[PDB]
Symmetry: C2
């Protein structure tokens, strides 16, 4: 006879590239039974302007990998890596040359501009050269949507007709998952085969990889189709769970709480409507699950919010061939992933979740309705939304806009406010709690003021921050950005913002800029915006490898947290 | 075209047999979107003396299964099941007739006595008719051990010689996993394919299913080969984790702690010995892993205990063709799962773990060395063992035997005590912490008093309980049973006991009675012994489906805890 294992490279063990097989720009320095501590790793910049990547490695990590994890390598390169540690009280160091292979895009066709997604560095202020951004994007499969859930025949179907479809199985696309530095280089790749297989028909490996969120361990949760996962930066899949049997189509978000549970956004399969028809619902259930994959709690939004409220739905753009076209709801829209009222249609499209630990509640962004807080008791605590369409008793829960001095702000029922910078959010994403104790939201802005505008390019997106007084039931807009940047900063879908306390910036990713520009790449724009001065500290653009292909989100990742 | 799903059976949804596909004697009543509470299930006894199984079902369970779990069916039977609940304030009830299929043993050959293991009820005292016992046993594959880990060629191997084997991969056998009632009927079966596949050569489905232990959630953990698992009584696999890459060959035990971690017993692969030879060590490492499968801590026993101590090793029986044969240690014993001293041989054979929450330490049973407490700090706190062979400093940690009044008991270095019932344990199993605050042990008794006896049949096993004073470093024997039952109660290997506070009994399972009776089935004896009077409350024998085929363990299971 057989073949020897790799020999030791320096004063520890061998240096293994991509030990778990899912992360080709990582490596691992095998411990070979050495006992070490104070470990630190440095991956040197490539060329004169190369960004250096450096981090401490904790004991738990050394133990879990049986080795020193090496993160931050460049593809197809002779990476120069330094590892420093302590052993037998003595300070130790090795230098390695870690050759890597190439990043592969397994999903290409005649639409492909090239294999990888292009980056363009636009601005990097001094003090921000070190920043790393994980981009959660995707690439079309050659076949497109090839599978549907089978539904139940409705009262007025043809006698001869085959059964209809239900739910959202066709929301399925190959992942394109990478970390970019401030020189625009890929410094980490998640192999597309890690979770996905678009050529096989195993639904276990299908869906839309989304909701990449950090855990308290420096690892990450994600969802894809009918599973939810945890993985780490060495490409180790730490958890892979089937959704509990009652549920399906997990998309948009997963977030681990401080109680060791995970919040997910699913639909309910075999949901019995009042007319006795069974459907798979769309984006309108929330699960809390444990690490055993068991259900700790469920929020059925069809009994908490109002699936008949069409105030926003009726004001939406078709495109997100048919753009500018204000959505015309039909009472006979077949159940499915289709804009419409009622359980079985896309009436809510919930797309973010935040856990409020202070009172054991959840804050939801419903793209088609608003932002809402719902208690552990399944009651609505407040709503942030234009007042149109809300019946009693939910109307009583609408938050009242106010200025810095607390004085009511006048707004009409469509959300248009008088003599104020205050605006509500429309088709928003990522309603999250910031480290400052405030609510941050990416206000996409489709159907702004509950209508389409005169011309399509009359659309804008905002980063926005609110301060909420639950006791008084008032909301204050305390920070915004992007309304001036027009259509070149307009992300009709997806996207994210998050406040960064370390450098006092608002991090942002607009995921679908120029989505409608037929035949052009779609632009994902990573920003850091100085919170005090609104100065652009970072701006990096990522362009889709195929035209008119949305990006989903990005995260600002910190290597010093990755390997506790 | 298509086909409709099963229609609703009564006032909820359909009743699905073996919904997860791993547990043929379970069923599920689909909720079909009904909201219910106060759920209770009753499976009626078969015939006149049939045992009824009854249990409440918690909200978590209803949510996780999307239905009412039905546990405790008989095979190939028209089971009569009642389900009661509350809905819209109104008390509700259905009766169902739940047909089941047969239990299948997929591992049979010319040694098979018949397809299933035979049960023989020997004694059931009044008030114990309801007891259920999960039997963790196994059945030989037709090929036997077919795989080895590849090792490192040693200093003095032949020049032409192929590389040697290492570790314990051949420790591999098909599982036979069921619940028996007091009429000796099978009331649950875990499909052998759930974890095992002996006809394929995928090592992910190989090993020896063991260490089945209840969790705080009423589910169970287990180990097999290179994986560890959590499953529930509906046959759902809730977790499936690969061992961390530095480790292999998980056996004997797995226990979840109150901190949400799990203790496992493994060996270390590519363990570098002092002479520089790499081996996979055998049964001499403890991991604490989290539910992400990451290592939280490790105990390397080769640096904490003494792998050169042959006091007990040299006194052991071969058989466990060659029995009565006292073990003759050789200095040239090739590395492997072989009696021997040093890392890479089976010098310790650790077979149980208990967590001590009061001081964050672990208590281990080393078959070949004794019982030991090891602290979080990786130092030995105490040792319960005959004094022969222990060097300083470990000798100062031996516990000193004492009587009820606290006076020293005189024992020689082989453990034989003078004018006392007190004895140590030899080749013991399951050193666990009882609800009373004492240490319970199954004292198998091979190599008792560090020798073989005059005749093979002069061997006995005991259930034994100790009270330990860590401060004084004293140990007291406070209870025992079985020494008077002779050879028909002798289990040279495996086995377990556990104190049961509910009915004040000592539960026991002797796994290997008559192992050496060539050509006869091996007996596994389930016992509940009254703690006060030593009266046999329950005695049920299970006979192996092939001759000379040991059982492992059994657990007393409680349906009222299964479905929180
Ligand atoms: O077509 N998409 O890729 C798409 C559409 C909507 C969408 O929902 S959202 O909340 O992210 O806007 C996500 C992805
Ligand atoms: O031979 N066996 O299958 C076997 C032998 C020893 C053994 O170890 S013990 O700790 O469980 O006695 C387990 C199984």
């Amino acid at each position: 006879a057989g073949f020897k294992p790799a020999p030791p490279a320096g004063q520890l063990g061998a240096v293994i590239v991509d030990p778990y097989g899912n992360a080709p720009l990582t490596a691992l320095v095998d411990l070979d039974s050495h006992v070490i501590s104070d470990v630190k790793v440095t991956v040197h910049g490539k060329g004169e302007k190369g960004v250096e990547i450096s981090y401490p490695v904790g004991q738990e990590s050394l133990k879990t990998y049986d080795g020193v994890p090496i993160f931050g390598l460049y593809q197809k390169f002779a990476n120069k890596v330094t590892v420093e540690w302590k052993e037998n009280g003595k300070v130790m160091k090795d230098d390695y040359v870690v050759h890597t292979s190439a990043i592969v895009n397994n999903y290409m066709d005649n639409r492909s501009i090239s294999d990888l997604q292009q980056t363009k560095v636009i601005k990097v202020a001094p003090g921000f050269e070190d920043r790393l951004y994980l981009v959660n994007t995707h690439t079309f499969t050659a076949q497109g949507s090839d599978l549907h859930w089978h539904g139940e025949k409705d009262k007025n179907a043809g006698i001869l007709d085959a059964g209809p479809a239900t739910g959202a199985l066709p929301f399925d696309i190959a992942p394109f998952t990478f970390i970019v530095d401030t020189e625009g280089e890929y410094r980490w790749w998640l192999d597309q085969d890690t979770f996905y297989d678009g050529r096989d028909r195993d639904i276990n490996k299908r869906g839309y990889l989304m909701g990449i969120r950090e855990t308290p361990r420096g690892t990450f949760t994600a969802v894809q189709g009918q599973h939810w996962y945890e993985f780490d930066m060495m490409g180790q899949v730490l958890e892979d769970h089937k959704l509990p049997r009652g549920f399906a189509d997990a998309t948009h978000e997963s977030i681990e709480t401080p109680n060791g549970t995970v919040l997910l956004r699913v639909g309910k399969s075999n949901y019995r409507r009042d007319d006795g028809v069974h459907v798979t619902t769309i984006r309108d259930h929330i699960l809390e699950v444990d690490k055993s994959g068991r259900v700790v709690d469920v929020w059925d939004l069809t009994k908490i919010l109002d699936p008949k409220r069409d105030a926003l739905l009726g004001a939406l753009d078709a495109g997100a061939a048919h753009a500018g076209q204000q959505a015309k709801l039909e009472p006979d829209t077949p159940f499915g992933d289709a804009l419409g009222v009622g359980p079985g249609r896309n009436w809510a499209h919930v797309n973010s979740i935040a856990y409020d630990a202070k009172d054991d509640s959840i804050i939801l962004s419903s793209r088609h309705q608003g932002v809402v807080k719902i208690g552990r008791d399944k009651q609505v605590k407040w709503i942030l939304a234009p007042s149109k369409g809300w019946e009693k008793p939910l109307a009583s829960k609408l938050l009242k806009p106010v200025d810095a001095n607390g004085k009511p702000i006048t707004c009409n029922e469509n959300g248009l406010c008088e003599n104020s910078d205050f605006d509500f959010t429309y088709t928003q994403n990522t309603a999250w709690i910031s480290s400052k104790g405030t609510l941050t939201i990416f206000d996409n802005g489709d159907g702004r003021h509950l209508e389409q505008p005169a011309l399509p390019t009359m659309k804008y997106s905002r980063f926005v921050e609110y301060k909420i007084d639950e006791k008084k039931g008032t909301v204050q807009q305390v920070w915004e950005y992007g309304k001036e940047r027009g259509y070149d900063f307009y992300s009709p879908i997806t996207s994210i913002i998050e406040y960064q306390a370390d450098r006092n910036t608002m991090f942002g990713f607009g995921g679908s800029i120029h989505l409608f520009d037929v035949g052009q790449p779609t632009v994902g724009k990573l920003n850091e915006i100085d919170y005090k001065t609104k100065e652009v500290k970072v701006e990096i653009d990522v362009l889709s490898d195929k035209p008119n292909q949305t990006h989903y989100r990005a995260l600002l990742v910190r290597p010093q947290q990755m390997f506790k």
